[PDB]
Design a protein around this ligand. Structure first.
Ligand SMILES: [Zn+2]
Ligand SMILES: [Zn+2]
Ligand SMILES: [Zn+2]
Lengths: 96, 289, 269
């Protein structure tokens, strides 16, 4: 359902000690050694919400990998009431 | 960007009304084109067309269709007029900067209907009726195209069409905000029209044996307001419309009701009443006898 | 003998029972019109004149041996019997535009009965006749049959049919491309409507039990029978006996247990 682009070559190569605040929100290429590793956790990709008044499943919403998404309006019953994520109908992503 | 569906017959009738406007000749000139210039010399807003002219072109067609489905075709006829004005009168399109509201007026129909002969199969068509005027109200402004502000975000949505009711926008235009219910109204930067209500009664000679007179409410807009006095016999040309009526709750019979279909919704209440009464909206008012 | 649930009617039985009588009817008797095939003159002259309504007297049938059953069945289940009787006609007409024109029957000789106020609740959905004087009638009321919906994100137009009074508003646009939740809007003047009028009748029965002051009745006339009655007229009316629950007040969806009564008119004399 989606194709990911990975850039292969890129001129400038940095060491971890050279980085400064002029490099923020920019493309970088670095070297190093891997010292620790965590397990595989799932991350929310296509999220479905429940309306706890009229029991409805609200459709796919996308997660940007920046901040958690929250809804506010039920289209069928017209409410801003409690809303909870449907774990069973959600599709997740790999994280490490 | 979703593709909007178009009415093919609407396009054909628009093209036909454009040919009607630009190619009519009477013993020789183009009368409507002359009136067009006449409206720049004095800054008017209304166009008066004669119905007998509509019939003759394309024997048995353009006029039959416009009369029978006026409610549908009116916006397309307005757009055609706009395109003709763009061509031969582009300075008139601006109020002396907002756009100028245009009104069309048909008259001189073949037949005049009695008040006690109006039926519900003529809803949304063009007809002419007669009656006696009893009561008039003062002129008040009417909401036509409104401006709304979002309450989650603050964006501006302008030129919302009301169409006989207080309509609100159903989707924030920003691809990010997901607001669909919460809006506020800027009454300073909204466009209004002029509105009056007239009450009419059946003529004395047209009442059946043993019965009492009937009444009807007439709505006037724009430049047609304040042409009818109390105690007059007038002829009205306009469109037969329906308005909500809560007085019918109590009459015998089955009263239609509305509900939302729950077949197809994934699950783990908004019933509205369809009660209406027949009213009349006028474009031409004439006082006869 | 398939029996429709809640009734004793067999549709095929009654259709075949009815077409033999309609193709053969008998009766100080003449030899010019009293001894001829009656109803095929009535149908032929109808189609010749360009007419759509057949007027069907009732006691015709309580003699002819077959259709006796049908008289009792017509005076007990008017809804189901009158749809059988129309299909006989439009079948019988081509048997003799007539593939797109609709036929109707109008019984006008139902008898017996002794007034509205002598009828019990066990007489609901039955055929009765009334006589009286007309006083008032409300102007025509538009009744919705087919509704019009517009998608406000794609401009796709849909039409819906009323089913026993209820309208089903689609939740999702039908276009395979534009599939939105709740995008359907109702445009009232694009809908199809029908006629309805309410009459008030001062009943004039034959038997008046001790101490009955006059009262008034409500009649509902639809479509063709509009403006067919004027105040001051002494009329005879055939129709069905109905009941309906009313709402306590406009704001609440609550109903009242005691029912309201009226008559659905089919024939007027
Ligand atoms: Zn809900
Ligand atoms: Zn917004
Ligand atoms: Zn749509």
């Amino acid at each position: 359902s989606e194709i990911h682009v990975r850039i292969s070559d890129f001129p400038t190569i940095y060491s971890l000690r050279e980085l400064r605040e002029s490099n923020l929100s920019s493309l970088v290429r670095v070297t190093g050694v891997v010292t620790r590793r965590t397990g595989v956790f799932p991350q929310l990709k296509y999220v479905k919400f429940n309306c706890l008044k009229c029991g409805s499943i609200l459709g796919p919403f996308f997660q940007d990998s920046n901040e958690e998404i929250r809804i506010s309006f039920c289209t069928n019953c017209k409410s801003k009431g409690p809303f909870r994520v449907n774990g069973e109908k959600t599709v997740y992503r790999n994280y490490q | 960007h979703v593709k909007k569906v178009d009415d093919v017959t609407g396009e054909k009738v628009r093209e036909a009304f454009e040919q009607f406007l630009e190619d009519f000749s009477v013993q020789v000139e183009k009368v409507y084109r002359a009136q067009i210039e006449f409206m720049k010399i004095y800054d008017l807003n209304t166009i008066y067309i004669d119905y007998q002219h509509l019939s003759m072109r394309e024997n048995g067609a353009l006029a039959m269709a416009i009369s029978e489905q006026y409610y549908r075709f009116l916006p397309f006829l307005q757009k055609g007029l706009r395109r003709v004005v763009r061509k031969y009168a582009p300075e008139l399109l601006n109020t002396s900067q907002t756009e100028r509201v245009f009104q069309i007026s048909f008259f001189n129909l073949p037949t005049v209907h009695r008040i006690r002969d109006i039926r519900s199969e003529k809803i949304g068509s063009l007809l002419s009726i007669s009656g006696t005027v009893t009561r008039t109200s003062e002129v008040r402004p009417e909401l036509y195209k409104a401006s709304f502000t979002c309450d989650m975000c603050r964006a501006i949505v302008d030129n919302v069409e009301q169409s006989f009711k207080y309509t609100e926008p159903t989707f924030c235009p920003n691809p990010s905000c997901e607001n669909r219910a919460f809006w506020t109204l800027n009454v300073t930067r909204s466009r209004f029209l002029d509105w009056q209500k007239v009450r009419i009664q059946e003529n004395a000679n047209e009442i059946p044996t043993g019965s009492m007179p009937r009444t009807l409410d007439v709505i006037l807009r724009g430049d047609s307001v304040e042409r009818a006095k109390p105690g007059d016999r007038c002829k009205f040309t306009g469109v037969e419309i329906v308005v909500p009526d809560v007085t019918q709750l109590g009459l015998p019979g089955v009263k239609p009701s509305s509900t939302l279909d729950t077949r197809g919704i994934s699950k783990t209440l908004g019933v509205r009443d369809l009660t209406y009464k027949i009213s009349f909206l006028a474009c031409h008012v004439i006082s006869i006898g | 003998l398939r029996i429709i649930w809640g009734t004793n009617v067999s549709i095929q039985e009654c259709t075949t029972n009815f077409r033999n009588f309609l193709m053969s009817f008998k009766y100080f008797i003449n030899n010019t019109t009293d001894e001829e095939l009656y109803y095929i003159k009535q149908l032929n002259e109808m189609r010749e004149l360009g007419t759509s309504n057949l007027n069907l007297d009732a006691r015709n049938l309580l003699a002819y041996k077959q259709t006796e059953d049908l008289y009792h069945q017509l005076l007990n289940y008017p809804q189901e019997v009158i749809s059988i009787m129309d299909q006989t006609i439009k079948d019988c007409m081509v048997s003799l535009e007539i593939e797109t024109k609709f036929y109707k029957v109008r019984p006008y000789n139902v008898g017996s009965c002794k007034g509205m106020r002598e009828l019990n609740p066990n007489d609901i959905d039955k055929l009765i006749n009334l006589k009286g004087l007309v006083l008032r009638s409300t102007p025509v009321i538009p009744d919705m049959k087919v509704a019009f919906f517009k998608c406000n994100v794609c401009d796709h137009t849909m039409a819906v049919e009323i089913d026993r009074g209820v309208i089903q508003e689609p939740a999702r646009c039908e276009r395979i491309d534009c599939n939105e939740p709740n995008s359907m809007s109702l445009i009232h003047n694009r809908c199809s409507f029908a006629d309805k009028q309410v009459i008030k009748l001062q009943e004039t029965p034959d038997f008046v039990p001790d101490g009955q002051t006059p009262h008034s009745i409500s009649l509902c006339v639809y479509d063709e029978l509009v403006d067919s009655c004027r105040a001051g007229d002494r009329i005879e009316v055939t129709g069905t006996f109905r009941s309906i629950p009313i709402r306590a007040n406009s704001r609440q969806r609550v109903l009242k247990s005691l029912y309201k009564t009226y008559v659905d008119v089919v024939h007027v004399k």
